[PDB]
């Protein structure tokens, strides 16, 4: 797991 990955909603949701 990456703590710096997107922590928001998936932009393609």
């Amino acid at each position, epitope marked *: *797991p990456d703590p*710096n*990955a997107n*922590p*928001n909603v998936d*932009p393609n949701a």
Partner: antibody
Amino acid sequence: QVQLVESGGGVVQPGRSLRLSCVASGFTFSNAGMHWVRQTPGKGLEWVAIIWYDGSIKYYGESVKGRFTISRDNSKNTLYLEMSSLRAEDTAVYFCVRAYSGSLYDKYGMDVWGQGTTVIVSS
Amino acid sequence: DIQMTQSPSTLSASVGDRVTISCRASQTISTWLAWFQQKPGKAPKLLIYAASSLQSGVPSRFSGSGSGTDFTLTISNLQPDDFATYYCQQFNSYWTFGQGTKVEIKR
């Protein structure tokens, strides 16, 4: 405009616990990752914790791991920091900070900060 | 968990000057560096993201450069509103900050 308003700071004795709150407006809070960051004059700015938009993933700074808990209530547009086993190191201004909201990059920092709430750990 | 070394700790400038602030990361961080401005009693404000991207509403006299480990914030034609403290932040591996640079008024 994005607005973040922290509350819950004050004087607390060493070893005790305290909960901070941050109320968000001006954006869809339930879609945003959120952080706490603290500031001292002598140590500068220090990241405390992050929580995913839906509360399912959390990470903590090494020196608060096992003592602090980050949580949120999306139905209330509110972020929380539960602090326990408080120490002198924990005296600071505590800021609520939104994770960077755009999607052009696949590594994420932070964009908008609140006004801060002060925590004084003292006997 | 990456150490950010910011220089200088303080610099003195006049309105109209060009100011440069450096930030060195202890390991490579690609372009994952941000610059913030902070005034006393106020919250930090994001100026530059992803090393060189000027954020919306931030004057064009702010610019950032660098990749890898060495980064620079440049403030051209320094204005009265620009006297403040500036911090870099890496967002490659968790989030850590430089120690700050205070830009004060020369007289």
